[PDB]
Amino acid sequence: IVGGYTCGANTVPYQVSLNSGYHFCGGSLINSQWVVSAAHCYKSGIQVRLGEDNINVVEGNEQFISASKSIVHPSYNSNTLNNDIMLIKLKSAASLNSRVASISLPTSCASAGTQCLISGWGNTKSSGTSYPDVLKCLKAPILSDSSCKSAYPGQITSNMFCAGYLEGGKDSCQGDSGGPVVCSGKLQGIVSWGSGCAQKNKPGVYTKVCNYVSWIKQTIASN
Ligand SMILES: NC(=[NH2+])c1ccc2[nH]c(-c3ncccc3[O-])nc2c1
Ligand SMILES: [Ca+2]
């Protein structure tokens, strides 16, 4: 997260860290056994880490659970990143409490101007790598579709939305992928891509979760 602030331990209880011997992507807990992240974060050997704040120290509240299966959207295209969503089923359910909690899926899409909270342990520099030990937060608005398409002409599909600041300085970055964009208490976006980090006129692009709620429900129901 570039231009963000320290969230505070366990203030974002649905945030998860996907670990394969090191933190590689973020994710969101939507029920005690399922997590939603990005299809480009897929790999085998994933351990889901819940209740985390400092990813390099065990401080208490952490629950490490292995993934039983990862379901990448069948129409995910790795070249355009269209349908960049993946569901991970956990080997055992998580114990939910005030530090580990699920986030609700939306009933409607959000409109431009809506302010959202993006969080993650991704890079905090737009030029160079500085990865933090604790969770960072950033409040960003969803942008209008014209500003998004004017920023990435021909690269935005209807399953993507831009959120961020065109003046630059604040944005999500590498390491944040798969993580949550929460607006009014609902999961509305998944950190997907962007051109560099916090660059002027290059806002972050996110998976538009409201278009996948029926798919998420049907898939969890049959797995
Ligand atoms: N500007 C953004 N909102 C953004 C978000 C996620 C990213 N992930 C990456 C990224 N991921 C994997 C390898 C290289 C990258 O620059 N860049 C990213 C940029
Ligand atoms: Ca820790």
Curated annotation (Swiss-Prot):
The keyword Protease applies. Substrate binds at residues 171-172, 174-175, 177. Disulfide bonds join 7-137, 25-41, 109-210, 116-183, 148-162, 173-197. It is found in: Secreted, Extracellular space. Ca(2+) binds at residues 52, 54, 57, 62. The active site is at residues 40, 84, 177. SUPFAM superfamilies: Trypsin-like serine proteases. One of its GO terms (molecular function) is serpin family protein binding. Keywords: Calcium, Digestion, Disulfide bond, Hydrolase, Metal-binding, Protease, Secreted, Serine protease, Signal, Zymogen. Its EC number is 3.4.21.4. It catalyses: Preferential cleavage: Arg-|-Xaa, Lys-|-Xaa. Its cofactor is Ca(2+). It comes from the Eukaryota. The keyword Glycosyltransferase does not apply. Residues 1-221 form the Peptidase S1 domain. It holds the Pfam family Trypsin. Subsequent cleavage after Lys-125 leads to alpha-trypsin. Further cleavage after Lys-170 yields pseudotrypsin. A cleavage may also occur after Arg-99. InterPro entries: Peptidase_S1_PA, Peptidase_S1_PA_chymotrypsin, Peptidase_S1A, Serine_Proteases_S1, Trypsin_dom, TRYPSIN_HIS, TRYPSIN_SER. Coiled coil: none annotated. Binds 1 Ca(2+) ion per subunit. One of its GO terms (cellular component) is extracellular space. Synthesized in the acinar cells of the pancreas. Belongs to the peptidase S1 family. Interacts with SERPINA1. This is Serine protease 1. The gene is PRSS1.
